[PDB]
């Protein structure tokens, strides 16, 4: 087919929002993914959006991906299901980049950013949800920008589109500072997105990313730090897991292996989230899962009361294949927290009484 039905359906929504831009800049993957190319997004459209500057919606460039959803419906890349359910991964990515004075065209770098995010989705098959975060650890545009990480949210304008191949929603990338990423992790992504909406330079109502932003929302409004602190104290973290570098070693719907001792291994970044796991999750009666990006190992920490776990108070370390579940009691979680003040490799922590070891190791270990 010369015009792909999934593609045409999204274009209808684009036309609705941009009736005066029938011919926007669009980039494309020179060797398409379904022909062996490295980049999963077939196209990225790049629109001018005049916004509503008086309402703290600056003029900006609006990017929309094509490829995460099912464009073609002929099983060249995604599995066809029908009008019901998700089309491909069920969403496309968007991004809103503040226009800098002098710019006559959208910068093309956000297409490369989007390809990176999509490559991860296609390879890991971990999907993105509104409120999720993506740590990145470099200026998104390769400048010296403090904007070095991302939160994900519903696009504030693009409505879900019904296509012959399923429903497609639109998930907007929002650039954030390290401090803001951390706040979303320790509290909740939705809460931080809402704060960004209230600070024009940090996003405003449409969560436009300003790559020239030099200050965090907490530096702009110190009172916001108190709001977040109170939130972490009262609500804990809503983070149920991360895709990360991790492993474990041997030191109900299934029979599981009962482990006498366990050795948990993390890289620097995942290791730094251990206190969140313990204090922000387990002490709130919740669970937290580290899921390997490289392979199939996963470590799910559970607290007493968590339902549907195969780790129990009597047998607290239990595995089904590469999936480890570890039940920690409140008393022991509190002890671990004290011992992990520092949260330089390797770092080793050992609790012989509980037959538990934690190592923080270089990334290569997890290859």
């Amino acid at each position: 087919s010369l015009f792909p039905p999934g593609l045409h359906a999204i274009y209808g929504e684009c036309r609705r929002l941009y009736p005066d831009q029938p011919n926007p800049l669009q980039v494309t993957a020179i060797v398409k993914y379904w022909l062996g190319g490295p980049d999963p997004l077939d196209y990225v459209s790049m629109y001018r959006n005049v916004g509503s500057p008086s309402a703290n919606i600056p003029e900006h460039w609006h990017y929309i991906s094509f490829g995460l959803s099912d464009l073609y419906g002929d099983n060249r890349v995604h599995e066809f299901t029908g009008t019901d359910g998700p089309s491909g991964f069920g969403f496309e990515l968007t991004f809103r980049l503040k226009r800098e004075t002098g710019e006559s065209a959208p910068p093309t770098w956000p297409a490369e950013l989007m390809q990176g995010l999509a490559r991860y989705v296609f390879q890991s098959e971990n999907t993105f949800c509104s409120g999720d975060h993506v740590s990145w650890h470099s200026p998104l545009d390769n400048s010296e920008s403090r904007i070095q990480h991302m939160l994900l949210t519903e696009d504030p304008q693009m409505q879900p589109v019904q296509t012959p191949f399923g429903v497609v929603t639109f998930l907007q990338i929002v650039g954030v500072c390290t401090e803001e990423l951390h706040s979303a992790q320790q509290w909740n992504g939705q809460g931080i997105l809402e704060l960004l909406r209230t600070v024009p330079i940090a996003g405003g109502p449409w969560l436009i990313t300003d790559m020239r932003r030099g200050e965090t929302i907490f530096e702009i409004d110190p009172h916001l730090q108190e709001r977040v602190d109170k939130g972490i104290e009262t609500d804990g973290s809503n983070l149920s897991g991360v895709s990360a570098k991790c492993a474990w070693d041997d030191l109900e719907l299934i029979r599981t292996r009962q482990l006498e001792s366990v050795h948990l291994k993390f890289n620097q970044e995942s290791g730094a989230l251990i206190p969140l796991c313990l204090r922000g999750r387990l002490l709130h009666g919740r669970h937290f899962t580290y899921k390997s990006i490289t392979g199939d190992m996963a470590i799910t920490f559970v607290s007493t009361g968590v339902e549907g776990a195969f780790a129990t108070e009597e047998h607290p370390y239990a595995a089904h294949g590469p999936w480890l579940q570890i039940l920690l009691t409140e008393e022991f979680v509190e002890k671990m927290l004290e011992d992990l003040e520092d949260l330089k490799l390797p770092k080793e922590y050992s609790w012989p009484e509980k037959k538990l070891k934690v190592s923080i190791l270089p990334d290569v270990v997890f290859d």
Binding site: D132, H133, S135, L239, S243, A244, K245, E269, S270
Partner: peptide
């Protein structure tokens, strides 16, 4: 619950 996708560029 929300999810973190960590250092997915590497």
């Amino acid at each position: 619950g929300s999810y973190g996708h960590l250092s997915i560029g590497t």
